[PDB]
Ligand SMILES: *[C@@H]1O[C@H](CO)[C@@H](O)[C@H](O)[C@H]1NC(C)=O
């Protein structure tokens with residue numbers, strides 16, 4: 001924060017290396033999921049059961 | 050998908066006899082069945098609308114029972130005024146509906 005620097009040593013900041021690629025991994029299950037059987041079903045059960 | 054089967058395809062009997070019929074399914078469907086009768090003509094008719102519950106306005110010569118995937122219908126005393134077509138159908142999805150195949154009856 002000045003226009004003049006005295007003789008010596010100084011410490012300013014830090015450095016970090018950057019990545020270059022993106023990787024994702026998931027299991028290979030490919031079955032359609034049965035949400036249909038419950039949401040639009042015909043008759044629902046009773047509260048006490 | 051849901052698929053039915055009926056058995057046997059046809060049978061014949063005489064008056065005053067017990068008759069039976071079987072309807073089978075590929076997976077349990079929890080007693081949501083019914084049967085339809087349709088004589089040669091125009092209008093199919095509702096006969097039994099549950100596992101063992103019958104529609105009003107029909108005499109008491111009919112019975113039937115079942116659960117899981119095993120379902121049987123029967124008539125205790127055949128009468129000559131019974132020559133028609135029969136079917137079993139099911140329902141568990143809001144719309145995925147299908148009838149069976151067909152059962153034939155003939156008199157002696
Ligand atoms: C799919 O995942 C299974 C799980 O072990 C694995 O054995 C298989 O090699 C993977 N790939 C294919 C094409 O099945």
Ligand SMILES: *[C@@H]1O[C@H](CO)[C@@H](O)[C@H](O)[C@H]1NC(C)=O
Pocket residue numbers: 035036039040143
């Ligand atoms: C249930 O049935 C309705 C019929 O209109 C459909 O729009 C809906 O997507 C179905 N539910 C599921 C989870 O598929």
